Ligand binder design. Structure first.
Ligand SMILES: O=C(O)CN(CCN(CC(=O)O)CC(=O)O)CC(=O)O
Length: 67
């Protein structure tokens, strides 16, 4: 597809706090996250916060897929 297409985003419907751990992504409810891998692994997805531009793994269950 055209370069830049295929983006998938989710909306945080619960907040998630990484703590002192750069592998995990923090976000507040309402933040949008662009997925950067094709599937969740063991219930964890990986993406980038629209608000903070940080990246990391998070519980997929804390979000819902935007359509
Ligand atoms: O529709 C809204 O008011 C805001 N939507 C924008 C995108 N919507 C559009 C819609 O529902 O008509 C799709 C979605 O929430 O998946 C985001 C949200 O609920 O936080």
């Amino acid at each position: 597809g055209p370069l830049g297409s295929g983006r998938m985003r989710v909306k945080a419907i619960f907040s998630h706090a990484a703590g002192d751990n750069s592998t995990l992504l923090s976000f507040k409810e309402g933040d949008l996250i662009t997925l950067l891998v094709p599937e969740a692994r063991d219930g964890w997805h990986y993406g980038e916060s629209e608000k903070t531009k940080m990246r990391g793994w998070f519980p997929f269950s804390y979000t819902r897929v935007l359509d």
